[PDB]
Scaffold this active site. Structure first.
Site, PDB file in Angstrom:
ATOM      1  N   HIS A 193     -54.367 -95.455 -66.001  1.00  0.00           N
ATOM      2  CA  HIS A 193     -54.058 -96.613 -66.157  1.00  0.00           C
ATOM      3  C   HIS A 193     -55.177 -97.513 -66.898  1.00  0.00           C
ATOM      4  O   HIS A 193     -54.907 -98.242 -67.658  1.00  0.00           O
ATOM      5  CB  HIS A 193     -54.009 -97.277 -64.781  1.00  0.00           C
ATOM      6  CG  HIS A 193     -53.505 -98.937 -64.615  1.00  0.00           C
ATOM      7  ND1 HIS A 193     -52.365 -99.069 -64.660  1.00  0.00           N
ATOM      8  CD2 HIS A 193     -54.100 -99.973 -64.633  1.00  0.00           C
ATOM      9  CE1 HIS A 193     -51.861-100.557 -64.797  1.00  0.00           C
ATOM     10  NE2 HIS A 193     -53.233-100.811 -64.670  1.00  0.00           N
ATOM     11  N   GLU A 194     -56.447 -97.197 -66.646  1.00  0.00           N
ATOM     12  CA  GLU A 194     -57.514 -98.313 -67.159  1.00  0.00           C
ATOM     13  C   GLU A 194     -57.957 -97.682 -68.524  1.00  0.00           C
ATOM     14  O   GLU A 194     -58.243 -98.351 -69.308  1.00  0.00           O
ATOM     15  CB  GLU A 194     -58.779 -98.069 -66.070  1.00  0.00           C
ATOM     16  CG  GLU A 194     -58.389 -98.422 -64.653  1.00  0.00           C
ATOM     17  CD  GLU A 194     -57.984 -99.837 -64.409  1.00  0.00           C
ATOM     18  OE1 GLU A 194     -57.038 -99.984 -63.575  1.00  0.00           O
ATOM     19  OE2 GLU A 194     -58.467-100.738 -65.149  1.00  0.00           O
TER      20      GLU A 194
ATOM     21  N   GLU B 128     -50.575-105.902 -67.685  1.00  0.00           N
ATOM     22  CA  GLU B 128     -50.355-105.047 -66.954  1.00  0.00           C
ATOM     23  C   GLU B 128     -48.758-104.580 -66.816  1.00  0.00           C
ATOM     24  O   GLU B 128     -48.894-103.202 -66.670  1.00  0.00           O
ATOM     25  CB  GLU B 128     -50.671-105.580 -65.327  1.00  0.00           C
ATOM     26  CG  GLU B 128     -52.063-106.153 -65.136  1.00  0.00           C
ATOM     27  CD  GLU B 128     -52.692-104.803 -64.721  1.00  0.00           C
ATOM     28  OE1 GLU B 128     -52.193-103.409 -65.149  1.00  0.00           O
ATOM     29  OE2 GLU B 128     -54.014-104.670 -64.531  1.00  0.00           O
TER      30      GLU B 128
ATOM     31  N   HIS C  98     -55.396 -99.607 -70.806  1.00  0.00           N
ATOM     32  CA  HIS C  98     -55.854-101.078 -70.913  1.00  0.00           C
ATOM     33  C   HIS C  98     -57.149-100.555 -72.105  1.00  0.00           C
ATOM     34  O   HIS C  98     -57.202-101.293 -72.742  1.00  0.00           O
ATOM     35  CB  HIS C  98     -56.807-101.504 -69.809  1.00  0.00           C
ATOM     36  CG  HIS C  98     -55.776-101.949 -68.876  1.00  0.00           C
ATOM     37  ND1 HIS C  98     -54.619-102.725 -69.263  1.00  0.00           N
ATOM     38  CD2 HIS C  98     -55.610-101.705 -67.603  1.00  0.00           C
ATOM     39  CE1 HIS C  98     -54.115-103.255 -68.173  1.00  0.00           C
ATOM     40  NE2 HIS C  98     -54.484-102.667 -67.188  1.00  0.00           N
TER      41      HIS C  98
HETATM   42 ZN   LIG Z   1     -54.396-102.893 -64.855  1.00  0.00          ZN
END
Ligand SMILES: [Zn+2]
Length: 393
Positions: free
Chosen positions: A212-213, A239, A216
Site C-alpha cells: 500500500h505505502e 487512498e 503511495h
Molecule cells: Zn494510504
C-alpha cells in the site's frame, strides 16, 4: 540466495559506510541498511522526520502505544529481517517486481536551483552518510522504510516539502519515508463464502500493508500524487486510487482524465527544464539528463530529445495510478484482505513473520502443506492463535 535485497544484513553487521552506515535525516545518527539501490531501512522508531513528533509518549479509533518497541538490537535485527522478507515477498510477484522497479527508477528530479539553466539536487532528496573515517557525504535515495513514531500502527508515506514546489504533485517527486512495522498487523473481517461463519477475525498480511505505502511512494516519486484536499463526501482520492478495485471508480472518470493531462503537462514542463539546462552541480549533466529521460520514458531526436511520448506517458501513468493498487496485490498474494479501504481495523496483533515456520515469501501466514493452506486459516486469528497475540487500543 536473495534477489531484491543484495545481502542478508544482521544489525550486528559492521558499518562499512556504503550499505551499513550511520546517517542523518536532513539530530543524531542512526544505523541504516541499504537493502537495494536507492532503498534504505532505518530500524528505529521515527523520532526524526517530524521536528514536533520527537517523542513516543501517548497523547484515532484503533491506536497502539508502546515506547519500548524497536529498542533492543534483538528487535531491530528482527524489524530489519521483517522488512527484508516483506520486500522479497512483494518482489516475488510480477506486480511487486514492476512496482519496485518503477520505485528504483523514480529518482527525484533535480529542480533545486533558483537558476533556470542549472540542474541541482534538492537537499531533502538526500541523506548524509558518515563514512568510516568519521566524515559525512550526502547520498541520494528514493525510499526509506523506517519504524513507526508513537502510534505503532500509524503507517504512512511522507516526504520533505519545498518552500514553493509541491514535489509529490508537480511531477518532480521527492524522497519517500514510510513509517512501517512488520511486527504488528491489524484484524479486518470477511466471513468467507459455507455461507456465513459469523464474526471471526482475520489478519492483514503485512506484505499488503507494505505494498500500500510503496504504491503511495511510487505515486509521490513520480510527482503525480493527488492533493489530500481531493476527497469523497470523508476519503482521500489518493487512498481510493491506491486501494483500487470496487473503490477505484468512486473517483469520477471526469477528474481521472483532468488528473492525467495535468501530469502530462508537468512532465513536458520537466522535459523542457532538462533541454533548457546548460549546467549541473556536484555526475555528468548528460548522465543525469539520461536518468530522468529513463525515468519519464523520454524519447529521441538529434536536436535534443525533449518530446514526451503521450502514448508512453499513458502506460507509465496507469501502471502507477490504476494497476499498482492494494486490490491487485491481494489477487497476487492470494490472501484474505479488506474488500474496501472504507473498512476499519478492529484488533491489533503481535506477529513475527521472520521465522520461515511463521511466514514465507510465497504464502505468507497461509503455509503450503498445512491446515493454514485452506480457507486462509493462516490469517484466521482463531485457528493460527500461535502467530497472533491480540492487543487493544
Ligand atoms: Zn494510504
Amino acid at each position: 540466495h536473495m534477489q531484491f535485497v543484495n545481502k542478508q544484513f544482521n544489525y550486528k553487521d559492521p558499518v562499512n559506510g556504503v550499505d551499513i552506515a550511520y546517517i542523518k535525516i536532513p539530530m543524531q545518527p542512526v544505523k541504516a541498511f541499504k537493502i537495494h539501490n536507492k532503498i534504505w531501512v532505518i530500524p528505529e522508531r521515527d523520532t526524526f522526520t517530524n521536528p514536533e513528533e520527537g517523542d513516543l509518549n501517548p497523547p484515532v479509533p484503533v491506536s497502539y502505544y508502546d515506547s519500548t518497541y524497536l529498542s533492543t538490537d534483538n528487535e531491530k535485527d528482527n524489524y530489519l529481517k521483517g522488512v527484508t522478507k516483506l520486500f522479497e515477498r512483494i518482489y516475488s510477484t510480477d506486480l511487486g517486481r514492476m512496482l519496485l522497479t518503477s520505485i528504483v527508477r523514480g529518482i527525484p528530479f533535480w529542480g533545486g536551483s533558483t537558476i533556470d539553466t542549472e540542474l541541482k539536487v534538492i537537499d531533502t532528496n538526500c541523506i548524509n552518510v558518515i563514512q568510516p573515517d568519521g566524515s559525512y557525504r550526502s547520498e541520494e535515495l528514493n525510499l526509506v522504510i523506517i519504524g513507526p513514531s508513537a502510534d505503532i500502527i500509524q503507517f504512512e508515506c511522507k516526504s520533505f516539502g519545498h518552500e514553493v514546489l509541491n514535489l509529490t504533485r508537480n511531477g518532480y517527486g521527492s524522497t519517500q519515508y514510510i513509517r512501517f512495522s512488520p511486527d504488528f498487523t491489524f484484524g479486518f473481517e470477511e466471513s468467507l463464502e459455507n455461507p456465513l461463519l459469523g464474526a471471526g477475525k482475520f489478519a492483514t498480511d503485512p506484505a499488503v500493508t507494505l505494498a500500500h505505502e510503496l504504491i503511495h511512494a511510487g505515486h509521490r516519486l513520480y510527482g503525480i500524487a493527488i492533493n489530500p484536499n481531493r476527497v469523497f463526501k470523508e476519503v482521500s482520492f489518493e487512498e481510493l486510487r491506491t486501494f483500487g478495485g470496487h473503490d477505484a471508480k468512486f473517483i469520477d472518470s471526469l477528474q481521472e482524465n483532468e488528473f492525467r493531462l495535468y501530469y502530462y503537462n508537468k512532465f513536458k514542463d520537466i522535459a523542457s527544464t532538462l533541454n533548457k539546462a546548460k549546467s549541473i552541480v556536484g555526475a555528468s549533466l548528460q548522465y543525469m539528463k539520461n536518468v530522468f529521460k529513463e525515468k519519464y520514458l523520454l524519447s529521441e531526436d538529434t536536436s535534443g530529445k525533449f518530446s514526451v511520448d503521450k502514448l508512453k506517458f499513458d502506460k507509465l501513468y496507469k501502471m502507477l495510478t490504476e494497476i499498482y493498487t492494494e486490490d491487485n496485490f491481494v489477487k497476487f498474494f492470494k490472501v484474505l484482505n479488506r474488500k474496501t479501504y472504507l473498512n476499519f481495523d478492529k484488533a491489533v496483533f503481535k506477529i513475527n513473520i521472520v521465522p520461515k515456520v511463521n511466514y514465507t515469501i510465497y504464502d505468507g501466514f497461509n503455509l503450503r502443506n498445512t491446515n493454514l493452506a485452506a480457507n486462509f486459516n493462516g490469517q484466521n486469528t482463531e485457528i493460527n492463535n500461535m502467530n497472533f497475540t491480540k492487543l487493544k487500543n
